[PDB]
Amino acid sequence: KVQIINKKLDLSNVQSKCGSKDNIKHVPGGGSVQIVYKPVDLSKVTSKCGSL
Amino acid sequence: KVQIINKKLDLSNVQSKCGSKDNIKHVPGGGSVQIVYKPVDLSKVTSKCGSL
Amino acid sequence: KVQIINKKLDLSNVQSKCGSKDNIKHVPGGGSVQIVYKPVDLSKVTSKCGSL
Amino acid sequence: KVQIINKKLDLSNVQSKCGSKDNIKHVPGGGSVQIVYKPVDLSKVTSKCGSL
Amino acid sequence: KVQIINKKLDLSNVQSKCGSKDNIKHVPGGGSVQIVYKPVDLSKVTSKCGSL
């Protein structure tokens, strides 16, 4: 049994990474194999700003 | 049994990554194989702003 | 049994990733195989803004 | 049994990704195979704005 | 049984890395194999700013 329950209060993009099981490489006579899976997050918050 | 329940209050794009099972590579005499799956998130929040 | 229930209050595009089962690669004498599935989210929020 | 029930209040495009079962690749003497399925979301919200 | 429950209050993009199981490399007569999965996070917070 797998469930994803996280209590987070953030003024940005939040992500919950839950895979449980992982991947495996076993390609007979394989030439090139690449597995890239990393959740990417990028944000910013602006509160009370007075340039002039 | 797999369920996705996360309590999050965010002024941005939130994502819940729940796969449970993972993928496997086993292509007989495979040449090139690539698996890329990473939830991408990008946002910004603007609250109370006074340039001039 | 698989269900998707997430309580989230966000002023942006929220996504619930629930696959449960994963994909597998096993193409006999396969040349090129590529699997890309990552929910992409991108938004912004504007509240109370005074340029001039 | 699979059901999709998510309680979300958002001023943007929200999507519930529920596949349960995944796809598999097994094309005899396959040349090129590509599977891309990632729900794409993109929006913005404007509340109380005073340029001048 | 694997679950992800973290109580964090942050004005930036927070991520919970929960894989449980890891990946393995075993490609018969494999040429080149690369696995890169590191959640990347990058943000900034602006509160009370007076340039002039």
8 A C-beta contact, residue C13 and residue D15: yes
List chains touching E (3+ CB pairs under 8 A).
Answer: A, B
Reading the block at residue A28, the tokens are 């007979």
CB atoms within 10 A of CB D39: 17
CB atoms within 10 A of CB D31: 11
d(CA B30, CA C32): 7
Give the DSSP letter of residue A12: S
Alpha-helix runs per DSSP H in D1-52: none
Q: Which amino acid is at E13?
A: N
Rounded to a whole number, what is the distance in Å from the CA of C22 to chain B's nearest CA?
Answer: 5
Rounded to a whole number, what is the distance in Å from the CA of A44 to chain B's nearest CA?
Answer: 5
d(CA B45, CA C7): 21
Query: Which residues numbered 1-52 in A keep a CB inside 8 Å of some CB on B?
Result: 1-52
Reading the block at residue A35, the tokens are 């597995």
The radius of gyration of chain B's CA atoms, rounded to the nearest angstrom, is 20
d(CA D39, CA D18): 11
Method: NMR
